[model samples]
Target chain A: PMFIVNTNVPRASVPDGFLSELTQQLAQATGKPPQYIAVHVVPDQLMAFGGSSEPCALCSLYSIGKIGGAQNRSYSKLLCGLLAERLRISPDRVYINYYDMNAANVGWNNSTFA
Target chain B: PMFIVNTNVPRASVPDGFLSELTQQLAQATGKPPQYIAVHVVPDQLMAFGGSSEPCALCSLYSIGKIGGAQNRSYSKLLCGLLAERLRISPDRVYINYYDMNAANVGWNNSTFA
Candidate 1:
């Protein structure tokens, strides 16, 4: 299955209107209704680590980002959230992956879109 | 496909020897070589959030945790890491899930072992 991961941030910092536009594009790409999708939003601090047996200095403020489901549901939500604000879409139409945060090692990284 | 998620933290605070005992249990459960597994470790600060539209104050220090593969590889790593330190397993014998940090919304939560 495919997965989507992202860093969580303030809605205001999300490049205004990004959520709405992203939702529209995703809807078109996946051919699924907006309601059918799921989105997961988390903090950025939760994704830090220090080698094998040490905690990083910044371990107090992290979270994960997600959109879509089993395949790309969580991934889709993050993209949609990013795009919606930048692209200008309504937040209500979005669905996020709440489970992504609960899962181990699922966090935002450089290759999230890939 | 199953997934594992966790909050990244210092190796010292992982319940000491938690990693080794976990690995032994996992090896018994899956009957797979320890070397074949992958482990992902991230910081705990990366998994923070503020409602749906805002960034939590601690977002800067979050990260994800992982171990094992496919079904529970990443999860296994985190458990192993924790158990290794607490249970007294050799650190070199452990493998972790590095990908957990890259996936969005995959961070430490209340239900890590469930």
Candidate 2:
């Protein structure tokens, strides 16, 4: 069970209770609490890899078990869209990375605890 | 064989002979040399997610194959702790990442490489 939530924000600003709010929303929608959740907000300089400093957005999510008997493949997109809507940003301006259990395990387990 | 060494310093200062000393120490420790090593120093602003300007330290080491019939897992920890002690920085301030053949391969292989 691994879920990595990474986003590129113009600044390091985060909404109040962002984590708890997101978790609750997801739990309500899916009827299951996430096993693990991690969020990172990288600055434009680092997120763009030496690209423009223009504000950009990115988000990712992973679910260990089957999300809705099919997998939460759309979780990232949904999240980005929701966040963008709230931030009054266009969906096209958002980037996301959502994966199933297998992919999440591979990425997270590799980065630190591998 | 893979080894990654990261440390947080008051600044991005690195000791001379840092890598070489660690390798040698491991060689002496296990009677065999290392194959690969990597180092990274995260700035204070980026390190604490948002903290003091005082530089921190981080180090990691990983080794594959049996070194003198045993794994070379002590390299990164020894390097950072030794350097921190020498620099008069608290051992707590010195962060290290070291892994055996299996752990090294796991962390390395799981990253973008995977």
Candidate 3:
């Protein structure tokens, strides 16, 4: 599983060990091992939502399974809570897209996950 | 179409007008008007692959159509080439996820694209 975060929050403002903390939370939520969960934090981006840029985020969770389903609502709730608490972003200001990828669509170490 | 780029490259390293240039290129490639295309560049991220932290990127292209098909190969080639040229990241190190989204799944201006 890979979680990518693109946010308008500046990097300097993020809490220490936030990515690591996120990885652990994702693992607990998805029942996946931490080693298999990769988190990418891309902060201080130029973004807007509803014609406003008041500390919003656009994020995605890509996984072969355990996502892109009804579970997304649960994940969204969890993630939005974290974002609001840590980044001071409102839940209404965040949008998260979920992806259920095929093994063949994922490439790593010069080969597909398939 | 929305193109999101997440990379370890610093924001200062990106060339001037790169996002606008990319928007124009995407419009040409997707046959969509420039106004309909959105490009997001999230630079200076904490990311790694294959136990390495070398310059690399993870990106996604989300659109209602014009993707998630044979055309993906063309997009991958074009995008990898661009990344290599502009960010000096090797094509092999970049991973792109293509999404053919449903209109109901996208939101804008306080409403879904639906």
Candidate 4:
């Protein structure tokens, strides 16, 4: 199973090694190799936490199995905790959207896993 | 309820203040105040929409209700049209992921909606 964890960090600040650690944790959470994980971060986004435009984040996880499924509470907890620690934000300001996508909808090296 | 409309436009784009207009349209669709809608755009992404490295878009719409639905046909159509025009992409080249989140999962100010 492959997973792409996309993060939207609404800050112009961060740790230097956050992305690496994030990818590793995602790999562990999804039971995939670290090299197999693809993590993309878009920083300094204009987002609102609740109705206030504050420092917050949105993490959307797309995967083949074990995620992109309904059993995502633990996944959400793991990520929320991570963001809270790394990004220096409360868990309330973060949201995670998990999707179990068909391999046909995701592509790699000019082909999808389907 | 807050809605975050995140866009991945795979292009070096134009149209200043598109994000503002995007929020307006999203407000119309979600029946929320423009002040309550949050819009974000990530231009020139490294995404392969529909397995093609072509000009395309990925719109993820998250709301408290009226979205994140099994009956998001109208929502999809409304957003796809807006993106295809503003971004110069085909409707098929655009994908919208709508999420209906709980108040607990979203935050405002220093606390969560829960």
Candidate 5:
């Protein structure tokens, strides 16, 4: 399972139904079931990169596995393109940080994933 | 040396000067210089936890060192207390995930810290 949490600078609020569509898109992209995946878009906030805002985003992709090393390139490509097409953020302006967490470290429903 | 990114559900926008105060508080808490520390708060967003949309938060603390294992306890305590006092969220309702990135893995000014 995985989740993509986006913190970006957008002057406008997200349109209705966009998050649901994004969740579906992520589910397909990550090859994870929708039930176990979470997608959070925290837009319309203040942020900067390379000392400039310029419609940049800081994204965290947290998952149990399936990230790191050469694998990062694909994710970067996919995500940068996704944000560029969907949010108008330039590819160079996005930084996607990957966190491959241990099962025991994640919790849900009053218990740890372990 | 570190940054704390918060994704929370606050129906109202952040009050003026809150982010600055929060940054100062975090710099003191982490014993880091203010210029090297970054704090981002994404509020007034829709989110759910424990199957409900209460005042909860997902916080990511990323740093080069000074995090992991036993160290997380203090951070959880400080951040939980911080959010409870500042944002009206319950201590138990917050989840603080820590990421200790290698300097070589982080980039700045078109080059990695390595």
Candidate 6:
């Protein structure tokens, strides 16, 4: 599952099926499936960038696999682009904190992903 | 213990005193001071920021003893939120992401106090 949630910007609306599209994009980006991927969007919170209240954004993305150098670079490019295009934020103000997950550490159905 | 949870934009629709209840429950779960434990919930997705979401959530949290060092490991874990647990999404769909924080990195009460 992938979570593209951030509290760095204030968003009142979504780009219509943006989550689904982003889910697919994440699936493509991570070589996972749409069903396996999950999406979350939180907007309209009081956040700042360079101490300014503009269209800055922060993203927290976590996944079970497909991580590291090339993977990060590629995912960053795509994610930043998505934020810029849909959220109308700038690449400079957008910061993404991405994480690699292990199955055993992940919990599902009162059990572990492992 | 302390935590804040909200999912949709334009404000929230949570029950009265939900945060207070959440903090109390978290205090019980982690065996820490209701004053020492810190929790934050940003309802976004399945949509559990990690243990909550039928329509859903992505959570943003910051804490000290509860999510850092040896104490944080297996010392604290989030269960499903009241509604998300029995509602549309599976408790399994909820994903609780923990964090390690630096005092210098976090800005609180309109300023970085640390």
Pairs with backbone N, CA or C atoms under 3 Å apart (clashes), candidate 5: none
Highest DockQ, which number?
Answer: 6
Candidate 5 docking: what grade? incorrect
lDDT scores of the candidates, listed in order: 0.34, 0.43, 0.80, 0.64, 0.65, 0.59
Please report how far candidate 2 places residue A76 from its true position, in Å.
3.6
Per-residue lDDT tens digits of candidate 4, residues B1-114? Answer: 334333455435636656666767677777877655656666766777667877777667777777644448877787777777777767888777767776544433333444
- Model 1 lDDT per residue over B51-88, tens place: 32121111111123332355464445545555355534
DockQ agreement of candidate 5 with the native complex: 0.12
- Candidate 5 residues lying further than 4 Å off, grouped into runs, are A1-8, A11-43, A48-114, B1-8, B11-13
How well does candidate 6 score on lDDT at residue A52?
89
What are the per-residue Cα lDDT tens digits for candidate 5 across A1-114? 554545565536455676687678767767778887877777765654433446766666777776555455656666676677677777766656666789899999999889
Query: What digit string (tens of lDDT, one per residue) describes model 3 on residues A75-111?
Result: 9999999999998899999999898897655544333
Q: Report clash pairs, candidate 4.
A: A50-B107, A68-A99, A68-A100, B68-B100
Where in model 2 is the C-alpha error above 4 Å?
Answer: A1-8, A28-35, A44-54, A67-73, A102-114, B1-35, B39-114
Off by over 4 Å in 4: A1-12, A68-70, B1-38, B41-59, B68-114
Q: Docking quality tier of candidate 6?
A: incorrect
Residues B1-114 of candidate 2 have per-residue lDDT tens digits of 333433234444555665576566665655554544433433322322112213334333444544321132243345545665544444433333333345424554547322
Worst 10 residues of 2 chain B by lDDT: B44-53
Q: Pick the candidate with the highest lDDT.
A: 3
Using lDDT, rank the candidates from best to worst: 3, 5, 4, 6, 2, 1
Per-model clash counts, in order, read 147, 20, 0, 4, 0, 24
Full candidate order by TM-score, most accurate first:
6, 3, 4, 5, 2, 1
lDDT of 3 at B87: 84
Q: For model 2, how does the per-residue alpha-carbon lDDT over A25-98 read when each residue is reduced to its tens digit? A: 56545456432332333343444423644445655444444464334545655566657755444565666554
For candidate 2, the TM-score of chain A alone versus the native chain A is 0.55
**Best TM-score goes to which candidate?**
6
